[PDB]
Amino acid sequence: TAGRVVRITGPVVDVEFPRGSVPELFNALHAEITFGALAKTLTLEVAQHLGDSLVRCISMQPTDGLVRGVEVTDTGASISVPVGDGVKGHVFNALGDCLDDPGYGKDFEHWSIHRKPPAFSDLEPRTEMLETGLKVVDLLTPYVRGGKIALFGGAGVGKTVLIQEMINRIARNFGGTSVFAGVGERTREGNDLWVELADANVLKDTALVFGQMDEPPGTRMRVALSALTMAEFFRDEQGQDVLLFIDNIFRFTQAGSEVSTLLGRMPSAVGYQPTLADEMGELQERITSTRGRSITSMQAVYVPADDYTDPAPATTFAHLDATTELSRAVFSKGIFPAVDPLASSSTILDPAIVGDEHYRVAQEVIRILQRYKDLQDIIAILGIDELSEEDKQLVNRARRIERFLSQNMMAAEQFTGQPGSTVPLKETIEAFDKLTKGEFDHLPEQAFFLIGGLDDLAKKAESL
């Protein structure tokens, strides 16, 4: 009672089954491409039941070479991925096939990539700060241990560099298990991460699942779920604190959009699929942490057209506790990690959690930066000399604060040559309190660029 391919349109394949054997939605079907150059077993995922015993499926491997009328056999269950401590230290694709050691986990326990989010009864808010060592993040966008963190950004503003730096700052000393889901990112950076983790002996505690952009929409849809399944196994079946890095979670919605019109859906605003919010909500809600079981998830989010009003980033914003927001405007000015201090935010940045001193310093920094942003229009035309004395002093403060939020990160050694630096949260608060209060107005502003700490500030000021 096998199916039969009727209609092939790019990644979407229609399969007609006998009446009593139409597969359930999200089931995995196996076709076979027999052309020698592209011969393979093609995994389709039932996406729609279309009637007349037809189903419409999203192909995981490229359909190049698939022939109409070819037998399609139903697996009887959704796409399953290996789970267990065996996955740690290995590289998998969306289908659960190991890359660095083919046929490795074929005998492990296999879990469906599709499962309901944890019940609302089991969710409690997370309010524990995660000290990354980055001045800007630790000060203005403090990350939440067990919470949801995002690195929004345009195209090529440093999301991959910053997420690699966060892997270097959070996972290297982490006692639990890490999972990295490369969802439609660049394969070069995936291999760079693989070798970096191998050299630092973190690979033994890290599971990598790659669905990089060379792959068709099906994998770029289901790879995030495949990695999140391993993360959920570590969360539930083992109780180990889990890190879940995803890069880039936008590719999930973008792949859904890519297959949207071939599935017959009428496009929504900006050409996205009508199911953007629900499709992304399921995946995002599976990432939350349940009480006593922590997942510290960091999701690099890509903002199309550098437009933060785009439906995808805008809808993703509601799913996050901390949201660092890289901007091309800051990147152009040479500031690396390229964070917009004003657009970025964090829910743990309250006086009741980070303390009154940290909160006051962060809010004063944001106030100074907002006033500077408001004044930049005046300065570019009427000149600095026409500002108020207080506003002039504030502008001098704000330039130094912007440059001090820059930091020489470890992952950016090949961007600057100099080694990385780590700044304790206490030192960050003290330094920014001094800046905002004036103790450093006499130092040149270039002394604050790519230094990371007060000792480095003094050394670079002396070198100037």
Binding site: T261, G264, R265, M266, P267, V270, G271
Partner: protein
């Protein structure tokens, strides 16, 4: 006196530039709405 005259001229020029930029922003707002609707209804007509 010259500062008064120059700043009155600057304020008038800034107001005229604000009007021109507002007319423009309205044109691109309407054009974005139109283009979005054209894309949406082009997808609709094809499906």
């Amino acid at each position: 006196a010259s500062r008064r005259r120059a700043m009155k001229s600057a304020t008038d020029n800034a107001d005229d530039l604000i009007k021109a930029l507002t007319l423009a922003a309205n044109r691109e707002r309407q054009a974005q709405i139109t283009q979005e609707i054209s894309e949406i209804v082009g997808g609709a007509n094809a499906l």
